[PDB]
Amino acid sequence: MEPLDELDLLLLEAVPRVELLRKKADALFPETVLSRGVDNRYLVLAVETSQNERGAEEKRLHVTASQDREHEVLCILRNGWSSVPVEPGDIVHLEGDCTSEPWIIDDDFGYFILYPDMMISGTSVASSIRCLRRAVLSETFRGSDPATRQMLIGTILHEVFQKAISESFAPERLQELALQTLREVRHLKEMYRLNLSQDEILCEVEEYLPSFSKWAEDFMRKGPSSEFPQMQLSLPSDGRSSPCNIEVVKSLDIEESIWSPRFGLKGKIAVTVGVKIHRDCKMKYKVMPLELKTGKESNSIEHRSQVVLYTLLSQERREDPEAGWLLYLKTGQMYPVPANHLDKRELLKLRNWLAASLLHRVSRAAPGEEARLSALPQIIEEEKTCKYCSQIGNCALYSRAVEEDDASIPEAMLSKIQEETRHLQLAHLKYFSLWCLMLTLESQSKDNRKTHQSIWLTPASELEESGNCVGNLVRTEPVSRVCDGQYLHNFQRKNGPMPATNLMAGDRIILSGEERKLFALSKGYVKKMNKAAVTCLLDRNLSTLPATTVFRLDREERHGDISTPLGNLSKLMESTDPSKRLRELIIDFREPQFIAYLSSVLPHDAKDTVANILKGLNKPQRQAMKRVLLSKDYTLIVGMPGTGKTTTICALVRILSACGFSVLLTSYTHSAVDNILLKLAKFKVGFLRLGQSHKVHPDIQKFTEEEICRSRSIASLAHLEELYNSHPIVATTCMGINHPIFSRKTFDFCIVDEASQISQPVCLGPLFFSRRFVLVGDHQQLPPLVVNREARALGMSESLFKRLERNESAVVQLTVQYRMNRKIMSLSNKLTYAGKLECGSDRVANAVLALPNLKDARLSLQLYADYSDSPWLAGVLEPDNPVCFLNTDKVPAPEQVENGGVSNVTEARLIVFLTSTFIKAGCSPSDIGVIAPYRQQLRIISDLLARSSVGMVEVNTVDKYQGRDKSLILVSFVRSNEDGTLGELLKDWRRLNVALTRAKHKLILLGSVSSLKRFPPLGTLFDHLNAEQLILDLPSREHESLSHIL
DNA sequence: TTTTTTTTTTTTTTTTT
Ligand SMILES: Nc1ncnc2c1ncn2[C@@H]1O[C@H](COP(=O)(O)OP(=O)(O)O)[C@@H](O)[C@H]1O
Ligand code: SF4
């Protein structure tokens, strides 16, 4: 902006800006409906301050409830509300009521709810009173508040007390209760984690019991109303002084899980009780929430505030209970906590700053320039609180690795920060900082940012026609118990028919209700589903209102994933000797060491068994076990397609076991880990499988911790612990590193399968618990999926396997392969694997598609088409033509772009035919895989398959094909456009590679050469395919053979 | 701005200074 003139013209002045705000709000909250009434959500447009009185702060907002931008309702935040950090484009809900007329909310009237759809937990809001930063770091680095002894006691006691209040507080019954709950595997596990004594906990717990009876005798006695405890209790309700008498009648509800779209709060009410307030001779019955605390009788603000928040959660279900109860089981002493407006306001005010802090994580610095990690709420000056924080580690850490001539932050702390982080180097800090950025950006991506509006705002019918909102349903079937919070429930619709679609039994589902007052209820998953009935497992027992009721079921989705990675990252930063080792190997790229073979690298006795195992393996394979055995640090086994990695890992494990090594065996997916286990079962090799037995493969479920427990009836810390030390081999998934076993066990070796598909910080997990490790992967196959552009561009898709692969000394390749026949191999050998793949045998090499009745198959088709149009059909069916590309150029085959994904019905129509034929030629549909680049194209191909009544063949994306193979693969490349649009997907060399490597015997490829050639991987394909004349161009859609398919 | 997706769930609290 130079000349006088630039300035003149650069003067603006409302609409395109309003539009960019609507874009902005949908990056954060996609598809917020906007509204009036109870569940309003207005969109902020403008934010200014003014001055009343003289030096008093007012905040002036301009908001709208629908898209027509003229419905601008003005709004003023006074007193404290004035400083709530709203910027334009934010989604707000005024629960200080109104909508009818927002106007003025201030100290005395109205609540302001910044980002309502984002429900923050009351405990977090309570935490923030003392330290916002502490609360935020808790919410994001969730593992760094490790379970303590008091916390266990506390849970144990909570559970007993709820058990009691349903039943009796009779001492013998209380004893019976505590005695029983002390044996529950959940608690056994935590006793195990903290290496405690079962009986020591029993005792510690037992001393509380008397106080349970003291309380019950005081408040639940049933007798004269004079003779209940007597306290002042000023409600809103008119009259609130002069004492009155309190009588707990019954517990109505325990562990009431609640979500509030209204205040953007979530919470779990320990106990809901029926209460009678006796008042002279009159009585008033109120259902109120009770909070239990096993701590010291502090009556602390935290504690009270928790109750105040519980009163709000409650409104979402029933009348505003106006006040609630704080217990303190230690001493039996119940306190009244009244939900004053000042408190409710003060807290929702604070809960705004928290909702803000958690949502504003990454900073532009220049609207559209590269990302930054936003600083957190600053470090408090109250050294009393800091002193024992738990989150201090990360606070000091996040500080150093994201901070700022200035500082000016309590010099008392500045030093402790350094004490905490001096073990670290500049690269370690940079590494940490960057992975948090990447992870954050991924986490915040629009895919993992969709809200619960569908659940509580649109009714069930409209949503059931897609995704998942099955339900306007009923139960009558008695709830079966299974264990703790897993109760079996049964559902069906009232009266007649009713459908199914995206409800694949085993999903994540949220059970809500007909009306808005019964939203949330219980979350859980699905067992099995007949299209008339449906059975799904939940945490809550739902008997309270039977038959009257109707229930909508919905799904879920990720993002909060980042907690395990952030855990791992943060762990890597800890100053322990393992964490140093991994820093050096991973961040500082320290060269891994190997030793020279010598006679006694293996225990003498092991040697015979090893040799026998070795003998059954090809050279590359044998060379891989040698590397592992000679390693001091790590080993990278490159498992190129069909080279037998499952066979190989099993062999390794068998060798390592022979040598008296303990080994933690991991992978990304259950099936991946299970496949290896199955082999190991065959070899009679013992191992313990952690993880939820329902996700475990069936033949493996006998080895599960969960299963062995129920089976052998394990109800003691010694018998559980005996189980844990039962096997030196332990198998779990990378994410399942949160098991208590890893608080106490370490391994000689960690093995990670699919090491190249797992996101780097996740893969990092199992490594903390093992001396040496082995990543098995292949970087030519798919990487960890990184949705977000900017992150992918910062390197987030680099697997740990790849990262570490620059040390060649540690890389051993698996090349002898047993899947593809000489011809098909040759393809990927020329395109990708630089001639490195060899055939397992002549069997594998020379194998061709099994088609026992080609003869009558060929005739039956010619009963509409011609013999002379042999070009394709003859070449296609020909078993001895294993690789074949079909050019959809000369017959128009246009794509259909539909809100993101692309399809091609012509191509779909075309391949469905080819499928029918191949089954009819004698090839079992079992042995058939269909692949397509685009998810959308899968639908279409699936449809036309039920249309032609052939549905056993599996249509799926390359991804859902990793590591699996079929006898025949057919690929619809679905791209076919004029000379423009050219998606990112086909540019990817790795997705292509996987497609050309799924087939054993016959590989058939289908797309428009014309537009496909402009994708480098495909261009290069077409070259090798032309050289061998394996592309065969098609007739027009008019020709004798095609016309009958269109 | 170009569409590819598995895991872990009691993920809300259990205390303490
Ligand atoms: N050293 C070997 N000798 C003979 N056959 C092998 C060898 N390694 C792998 N195979 C064969 O390769 C096939 C693939 O191995 P497997 O581990 O079952 O699945 P994948 O290799 O696809 O994980 C198996 O049927 C197995 O018989
Ligand atoms: S350590 Fe002190 S500052 Fe850092 S978070 Fe915990 S409380 Fe807030």
Author numbering: 1 to 13, 20 to 245, 248 to 412, 415 to 1056
Sentences copied from the publication:
Dna2 has nuclease and helicase activities and plays key roles in maintaining genomic integrity. It is involved in the nucleolytic processing of 5’ flaps during Okazaki fragment maturation, of DNA double-strand breaks (DSBs) during homologous-recombination mediated repair, and of stalled replication forks in the intra-S-phase checkpoint. Dna2 contains a PD-(D/E)XK superfamily nuclease motif and a 5’ to 3’ helicase domain. It is a ssDNA endonuclease that requires a free end for cleavage, and does not cleave dsDNA, single-stranded gaps, D-loops or RNA.
The Dna2-ssDNA structure shows that the active site and most of the DNA-binding sites are enclosed in a narrow tunnel, necessitating the threading of the DNA through a tunnel end to access the DNA binding sites. The structure explains why the nuclease activity of Dna2 requires the ssDNA to have a free end. The active site is embedded in a ∼10 Å wide portion of the tunnel, and the tunnel entrances leading to it are too narrow to accommodate dsDNA or a single-stranded loop of a gap substrate. DNA binds to Dna2 through both its phosphodiester and base groups. Dna2-phosphodiester interactions involve protein pockets that are rich in backbone amide and short-side chain hydroxyl groups.
